[PDB]
Design an enzyme around this catalytic site. Structure first.
Site, PDB file in Angstrom:
ATOM      1  N   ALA A  35       2.815  -3.544   0.836  1.00  0.00           N
ATOM      2  CA  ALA A  35       1.638  -3.446  -0.013  1.00  0.00           C
ATOM      3  C   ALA A  35       0.727  -2.364   0.543  1.00  0.00           C
ATOM      4  CB  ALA A  35       0.893  -4.781  -0.051  1.00  0.00           C
ATOM      5  N   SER A  36      -0.132  -1.821  -0.310  1.00  0.00           N
ATOM      6  CA  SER A  36      -1.145  -0.915   0.195  1.00  0.00           C
ATOM      7  C   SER A  36      -2.175  -1.697   1.007  1.00  0.00           C
ATOM      8  CB  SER A  36      -1.818  -0.150  -0.950  1.00  0.00           C
ATOM      9  OG  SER A  36      -2.507  -1.021  -1.837  1.00  0.00           O
ATOM     10  N   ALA A  64       2.440  -7.273   4.181  1.00  0.00           N
ATOM     11  CA  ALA A  64       1.341  -6.392   4.564  1.00  0.00           C
ATOM     12  C   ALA A  64       1.799  -4.948   4.691  1.00  0.00           C
ATOM     13  CB  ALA A  64       0.714  -6.864   5.880  1.00  0.00           C
ATOM     14  N   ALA A  65       3.073  -4.727   5.023  1.00  0.00           N
ATOM     15  CA  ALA A  65       3.573  -3.370   5.204  1.00  0.00           C
ATOM     16  C   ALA A  65       4.003  -2.704   3.913  1.00  0.00           C
ATOM     17  CB  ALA A  65       4.763  -3.351   6.166  1.00  0.00           C
ATOM     18  N   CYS A 112      -2.498   2.333 -12.148  1.00  0.00           N
ATOM     19  CA  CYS A 112      -2.759   1.054 -12.809  1.00  0.00           C
ATOM     20  C   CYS A 112      -4.127   0.500 -12.412  1.00  0.00           C
ATOM     21  CB  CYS A 112      -1.656   0.048 -12.470  1.00  0.00           C
ATOM     22  SG  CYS A 112      -1.570  -0.449 -10.719  1.00  0.00           S
ATOM     23  N   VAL A 117       0.873   3.355  -0.146  1.00  0.00           N
ATOM     24  CA  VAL A 117       1.391   2.339   0.772  1.00  0.00           C
ATOM     25  C   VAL A 117       1.254   2.814   2.207  1.00  0.00           C
ATOM     26  CG1 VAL A 117       3.552   1.251   1.578  1.00  0.00           C
ATOM     27  CG2 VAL A 117       2.868   1.091  -0.816  1.00  0.00           C
ATOM     28  N   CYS A 142      -9.100   0.266 -10.248  1.00  0.00           N
ATOM     29  CA  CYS A 142      -8.399   1.349  -9.541  1.00  0.00           C
ATOM     30  C   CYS A 142      -8.201   2.654 -10.378  1.00  0.00           C
ATOM     31  CB  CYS A 142      -7.021   0.956  -9.038  1.00  0.00           C
ATOM     32  SG  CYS A 142      -7.234  -0.351  -7.831  1.00  0.00           S
ATOM     33  N   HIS A 188      -5.763   3.305   0.130  1.00  0.00           N
ATOM     34  CA  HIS A 188      -6.112   3.058  -1.266  1.00  0.00           C
ATOM     35  C   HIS A 188      -7.570   2.592  -1.386  1.00  0.00           C
ATOM     36  CE1 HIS A 188      -6.064   1.986  -5.351  1.00  0.00           C
ATOM     37  NE2 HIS A 188      -5.455   0.816  -5.286  1.00  0.00           N
ATOM     38  N   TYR A 208       5.872   5.988   4.256  1.00  0.00           N
ATOM     39  CA  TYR A 208       5.412   6.330   5.604  1.00  0.00           C
ATOM     40  C   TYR A 208       6.058   7.615   6.113  1.00  0.00           C
ATOM     41  CZ  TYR A 208       3.046   1.835   6.054  1.00  0.00           C
ATOM     42  OH  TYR A 208       2.217   0.745   5.882  1.00  0.00           O
TER      43      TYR A 208
HETATM   44 CA   LIG Z   1       1.004  -0.972   4.002  1.00  0.00          CA
END
Ligand SMILES: [Ca+2]
Ligand SMILES: [Ca+2]
Ligand SMILES: [Ca+2]
Ligand SMILES: [Ca+2]
Ligand SMILES: [Ca+2]
Ligand SMILES: [Ca+2]
Ligand SMILES: [Cl-]
Ligand SMILES: [Cl-]
Lengths: 393, 393
Positions: A246-247, A243-244, A378, A344, A88, A348, A182
């Site tokens: 995390a990216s 899931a929300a 990172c 997020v 990344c 990504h 968001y």
């Molecule tokens: Ca997400």
């Protein structure tokens, strides 16, 4: 040492996994970003002396992915090109290596950026060695090369849970961070704060006019009332990562043009920003999550600056817990970090994000009439990269 | 500008396709080469500030291939690492980028090299998009990402035939060049001329002691009396390129340690050689074959040297016709080029060869009590890289 200036900086919008850009190869997304960076300053493509593109998942992209991007952007066949893979951190490492080529005296103008189409990453089979009797496994290339730690054989999300536990970052805090990402993303888009940096992608259609993809689509994929109830996908009991928060997996590219002082002045170009310093750092692979907090102080010391001298920060949001952990360790004011939203919510694409956050940081500094900014990201294997830039008003 | 010195330089032996190293992953071959380079000078691994490894075919190697090589070599988890892909120029580009990091002031000691296991490259399937009705194709990753020109969709060998036609290089001349490469390789091995640079690979066995692989095995895979009768594998009528006068697919790695003057003197290390200059060049993708003849003059001009100042040359032998064409264009004495043999006989692991020929050149210069050497290597997409070094007696 020669100064290094950023004279243009752009990015494609980011597509969702199997979404709007899933049919546009990474190298073509790179071509769109590179051409966009040249077009912003009406630069003769033959002035570019090298092209460095981050790209983590190169399988099936064809020979010389960085050449495909450069030639697709309209750079001549006299342009050298190289693809770089620091997971990344790839897009940021591309920019750093390009700056070193300028400082070393070897080039006066260079393109650096990154590209990824995670939707198009293949599955792998060992086709050369038959299996006389027994089932055969096809490994998902995304999971095998992108998202799985080699040494533990666990997903990056499991390392995110380790970070949440060690740094006492709760599910509720991660969800609040995600919701803020968001909200900030939607607000910045509505305020026109991504209009300058985003170059659209034209998508050919089987019949009819092309679709113009011009806006990030990930940040609209959220249901706020569902966030506190989603399951913890990496850890069944006492988990925190969802899931929300995390990216996501995404498709996109980004590109910057770097120049020496002498070259930009000979061309009459006013720089966007100056690269002040940069640094890499690494620690144990399972602690890649907090490596940005090790890399940024090195870059600051090289700049002869302190953390108080930085007006705005871009820390890539691989997970909400990563954003929270590095803010907590460094003592950063969250109102100064990822102020237009982060990965997020925005997405990504691995090999592009490290340069994408530099593109965004440049514009954050101008939008806020600021001076110094820092970006850090990172990477798998335990690393991070960091860069300090100075906005030129 | 700071000087950059090479303080150690080693390579694994090269294994044949599906041969002796086919079970040793590229990253582990990289680990063997890096550890070998450190061991030659008894260097504290924590002195290394970065690791750049060329690697063309990264699919299925797992996350962060350059980290896997570095950690496998015994470098600490505080060592940053990056993998670079300029196709066959990758290992040389790694060395050049590392030299730029020294000249830019950012590191005092750095590892650069390359690695490839062509035997282990997977086949690819698009597993995410089902095919409702119809046959499915699994692309060979070697052919798709390594050996096929994107723009023509033809194999590199077809571009070699274009070169043979344009430069009037006959089948008989290519065969004579190939035979000379085999003869020189066997002679140099018999004279002990590879003993210094080659570090062996220990190969674990299912039961019993490991096999120690210590010598290139490709150059013994030749039947001289069959060479003039072999079929032309890329062109049925009026062809010239054969399996014997083209290079092979191979497994291997190589690694160099670079240092500033101040760092090597503080450690009491005498350098092997000094990096004088380097350059990239590119032309039309179908003319990658003669791009070394464009890159080397750029490097010479940067060194303020002429072609007459160079005592020995290493030009990678992707095909016998490539070796002959660049010698012909530059007017080089074949007695000064690839004097210990070249890739047509020794093998060609794509991501390692560009640094491997530097390792070999260092030792050629010492074996011949010479001063300046130059190495150059072509790459898919139309590029080449070149480097000029000064032997330190
Ligand atoms: Ca997400
Ligand atoms: Ca709007
Ligand atoms: Ca504070
Ligand atoms: Ca012998
Ligand atoms: Ca051969
Ligand atoms: Ca001559
Ligand atoms: Cl790293
Ligand atoms: Cl190139």
């Amino acid at each position: 040492m020669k100064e290094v200036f950023i004279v243009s900086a752009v990015r494609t919008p980011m597509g969702s996994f199997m979404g709007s850009l899933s049919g546009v190869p990474a190298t073509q997304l790179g071509a769109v970003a590179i051409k966009g960076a040249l077009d912003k300053i009406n630069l003769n493509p033959a002035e570019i002396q090298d092209v460095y593109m981050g790209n983590v998942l190169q399988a099936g992209e064809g020979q010389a992915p960085a050449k495909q991007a450069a030639l697709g952007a309209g750079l001549p066949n006299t342009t050298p090109t190289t693809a770089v893979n620091k997971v990344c951190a790839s897009g940021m490492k591309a920019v750093m290596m390009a700056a070193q080529a300028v400082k070393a005296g070897d080039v006066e103008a260079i393109v650096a950026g990154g590209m990824e189409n995670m939707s198009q990453v293949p599955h792998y089979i060992d086709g050369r060695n038959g299996v006389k009797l027994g089932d055969i496994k096809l490994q998902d290339g995304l999971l095998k090369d992108g998202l799985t730690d080699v040494y533990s054989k666990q997903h990056m999300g499991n390392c995110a849970e380790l970070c949440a536990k060690e740094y006492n970052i709760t599910r509720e805090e991660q969800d609040a961070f995600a919701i803020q990402s968001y909200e900030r993303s939607a607000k910045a888009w509505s305020e026109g704060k991504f209009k300058e940096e985003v170059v659209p992608v034209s998508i050919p259609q089987r019949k009819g006019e092309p679709i113009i993809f011009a806006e990030d689509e990930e940040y609209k994929n959220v249901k706020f009332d569902r966030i506190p109830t989603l399951p913890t996908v990496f850890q069944k009991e006492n988990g925190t990562v969802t899931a929300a928060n995390a990216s996501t997996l995404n498709d996109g590219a980004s590109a910057l043009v770097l120049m020496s002082k002498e070259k930009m002045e000979s061309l009459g170009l006013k720089p966007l920003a100056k690269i002040v310093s940069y640094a890499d750092a690494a620690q144990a692979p399972e602690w890649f999550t907090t490596a940005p907090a090790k890399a940024l102080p090195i870059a600051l010391a090289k700049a002869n600056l302190t953390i108080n001298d930085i007006d705005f920060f871009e820390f890539n949001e691989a997970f909400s817990v990563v954003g929270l952990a590095n803010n907590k360790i460094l003592g950063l004011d969250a109102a100064k970090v990822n102020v237009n939203g982060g990965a997020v919510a925005l997405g990504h694409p691995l090999g592009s994000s490290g340069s994408r956050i530099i593109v965004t940081l440049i514009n954050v500094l101008k939008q806020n009439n600021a001076k110094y900014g820092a970006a850090a990201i990172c990477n798998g294997g335990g690393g991070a990269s960091a860069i300090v830039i100075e906005n030129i008003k």
